[PDB]
Design a protein around this ligand. Sequence first.
Ligand code: HEC
Ligand code: HEC
Ligand code: HEC
Ligand code: HEC
Ligand code: HEC
Ligand code: HEC
Ligand SMILES: [Cu+2]
Lengths: 259, 259, 257
Amino acid sequence: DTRTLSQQYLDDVRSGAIVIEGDSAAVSELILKRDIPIPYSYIAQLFATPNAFGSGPACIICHGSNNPTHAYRGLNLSTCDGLRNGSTEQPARAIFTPGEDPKNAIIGRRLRANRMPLGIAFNNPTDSAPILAIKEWILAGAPNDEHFTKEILPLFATDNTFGPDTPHCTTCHFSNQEPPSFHELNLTTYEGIMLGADSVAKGVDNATKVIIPGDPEASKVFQHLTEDRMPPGIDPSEDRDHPNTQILFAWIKQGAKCE
Amino acid sequence: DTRTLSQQYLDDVRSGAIVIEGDSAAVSELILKRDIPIPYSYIAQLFATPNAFGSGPACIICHGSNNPTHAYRGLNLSTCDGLRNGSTEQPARAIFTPGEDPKNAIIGRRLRANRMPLGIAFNNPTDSAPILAIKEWILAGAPNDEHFTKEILPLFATDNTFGPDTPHCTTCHFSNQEPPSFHELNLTTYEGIMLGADSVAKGVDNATKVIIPGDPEASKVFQHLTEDRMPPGIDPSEDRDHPNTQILFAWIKQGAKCE
Amino acid sequence: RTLSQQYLDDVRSGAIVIEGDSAAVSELILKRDIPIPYSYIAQLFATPNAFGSGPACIICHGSNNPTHAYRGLNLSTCDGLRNGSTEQPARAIFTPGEDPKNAIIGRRLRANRMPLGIAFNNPTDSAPILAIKEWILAGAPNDEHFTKEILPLFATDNTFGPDTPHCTTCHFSNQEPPSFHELNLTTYEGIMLGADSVAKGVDNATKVIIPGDPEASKVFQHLTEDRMPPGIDPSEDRDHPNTQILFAWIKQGAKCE
Ligand code: HEC
Ligand code: HEC
Ligand code: HEC
Ligand code: HEC
Ligand code: HEC
Ligand code: HEC
Ligand SMILES: [Cu+2]
């Protein structure tokens, strides 16, 4: 306001306006809430340092060029224009959009979204028959037909469908009750699937839909089935809301500026 | 005098001159004792990296500019001259002096000194009424009068004085013997407060004076009451003598050179 | 085929195998020979705990000036790395394009000083060590002098430092447990046979004594070389991913790109 950070701070401690709820309160209340500008120099350091978002190798080792024989997906995370360009190998695509919330863009999911069924190792195929079966079903408008009930619905209910020694989805997702069904997602019936997640904990018409008929690419189910969290092999129990993840998101929302 | 580092090393393992007590033996005995020059590049990396002096966000996020609307206190820790300039927002002040021991300068206190009462959260006011009373009392020459006995002395003995759900000072500071009273500081009486800390182990007057009559700014009591340890929210039990802190001090003592 | 293409082909083949937390590095970075950029390597020597607990390498090895850097060794620059130690006795710490596993840089990162746990403030030139060095120089014979004066050094407590166990505590047979690296130091034949004799053939065994040459002898190396950074705890991972990436870079030519 022409007001200094210090002044807003001193006013905020009087007010009681700052609330400390968790280990990441410094980041949450003083950095994100105050919209402090994030320098690209810090962002560069995140992609270059190991364990920057949770245990594993530095992103730039495997994604350090727009050459597809030196870097996976022709994705260059080591430069500001590279980040903005995204994957250059066909099918080429951006991994976020400057100025927009990246939480559910490709970069957001790769940092925060555990592959399903939870715990499955990255060396299991993401193009397997069951996955492609679901992809096609979603494409066909995700109908509730004979075919679905017979050939698709049991994929969520059978052990070892997407890899050896893996539990059926409905082990963890079988009701809309807060525990024991995670995210209150119920994958036992057609209706449970199209209802989506968190319908009890949030609005029933603010429920997180997991199937988007006509669109496999935007379907949380298909995304979770096909996207390995980064860096590859990162354990599921690693914090999905790492402060560096949040500082990264802030930088993107601020324009992904090379300044 | 004229020996190489290696030569002094080989001499000292023979002498028994090198002594090992803690994980930081490498640092204390081989780096600090030999005044190995610290490169600014390393120092820069310390303020730019999360957890560099203990758990928390990187300094340069909150202190990355001399613009007080982009950086707390207009303090720029991200450049060498920025470090040398210190806080630029009024009241502007240096946080250290090149060539001088920074242990008890503002930079040293912010890294090593836990705010009191120990454990208190940073969203409590540092200018509250009790703090101003104590400050006033110190300004007036810290007399042992009626006002002190009635209005100041009990501030060290009452729960929740400096914030909600905080223990009274005399919980941990009530005698001059090493356990159970921390740093042998006794705040139950006037004489104990003016005697200070560390009176048995180094003193009784090689003791750390904690009240400097006439000068609240230099008084450890007032400092510990008003200064939050950095980064904000850092847990008190985090090492106060982190090797990176010591390396930082070394760099400052060596002239704070920009290479 | 591209990296992505070799990857997707490899997951279908069953070609990728996962054994440890460090699976990503071994199978996706080392096995596909992704080029390692010097900029990353630089950051390794400049960051504390990069290869395991301890100060950043460049603090102690940050110049070719021996009053500013141990051994006049500069790890902070690419030409510095290739140069190695400049203080007499000057020597390179690796050779570009060759596996550095057993070069000086490799031993200082992976080889715990022996006997395991001995502190770095113990002399690496003590009488027992010179005795062993001399015995190796003389061709490592199995004579009277060896049996009476050398062999017992490996079976006696507090030989190489105060409160240190006899070597044969951990090295007395050729099986993975209980004898580490299948090394048997109780007999002449055991010492000359070496390590890894079961896991490799008996004629692919890793020799730990190289007669005539102490500098190249694994026994003498372990007795005299402190793992870096000084004071690093022995139980620290000897196969740190950063160590492996470093080795990859060196093998790739140690390019200043
Ligand atoms: C080598 C072990 C890698 C490390 C280190 C990182 N990633 Fe990764 N990434 C890797 C693979 C094998 C793949 C899949 C390639 C394929 O063709 O299927 C990916 C993919 C991504 C993507 C998606 C790109 C797209 O166009 O959809 C992203 C956004 C991504 N990786 C990000 C990322 C991050 C943030 C990393 C550091 C935490 C990281 N990668 C490291 C292999 C490796
Ligand atoms: C227990 C080991 C589970 C198995 C088996 C499956 N899922 Fe899962 N899922 C689980 C948890 C703990 C979470 C929360 C997110 C996290 O990583 O902790 C999830 C989340 C999902 C979601 C997203 C819900 C949302 O609100 O966005 C989806 C769409 C999902 N899971 C789908 C899914 C599928 C298709 C499964 C069979 C392959 C499956 N889950 C199994 C725990 C577990
Ligand atoms: C945001 C979460 C911050 C982080 C990261 C760091 N600091 Fe900080 N600092 C922050 C605030 C809100 C304040 C108080 C402002 C006020 O008006 O009271 C401070 C204060 C300091 C100071 C004191 C400057 C002075 O003039 O007295 C110093 C020297 C300081 N901080 C240093 C510092 C260090 C070393 C950090 C990394 C360990 C660090 N800061 C991070 C907020 C935040
Ligand atoms: C127990 C939770 C404590 C409470 C209550 C108070 N203090 Fe404390 N103090 C405590 C410890 C463990 C230490 C050592 C430093 C550290 O953080 O580990 C201290 C130190 C001080 C000092 C410094 C003495 C010195 O040698 O510099 C002072 C001046 C001090 N404490 C003052 C103080 C005040 C004013 C308190 C009530 C508001 C108070 N302490 C409470 C532990 C505890
Ligand atoms: C100070 C605590 C040091 C740290 C940090 C690192 N090293 Fe070190 N190094 C140190 C000493 C005292 C010595 C012995 C010198 C002598 O005269 O005996 C060494 C030696 C080495 C060597 C050997 C060079 C040679 O000519 O044989 C190497 C290759 C080495 N150190 C590497 C190294 C690495 C990789 C480090 C970071 C993990 C590192 N050193 C840090 C002191 C210190
Ligand atoms: C138990 C505390 C041990 C004592 C006593 C000795 N060694 Fe050791 N050794 C031990 C381990 C766990 C290992 C694995 C590698 C590592 O650095 O941790 C080793 C290895 C060796 C080797 C290397 C063989 C190879 O790499 O192929 C040698 C040559 C060796 N040890 C020799 C040795 C000597 C001379 C000892 C007495 C001074 C000694 N060892 C004692 C565990 C233990
Ligand atoms: Cu305004």
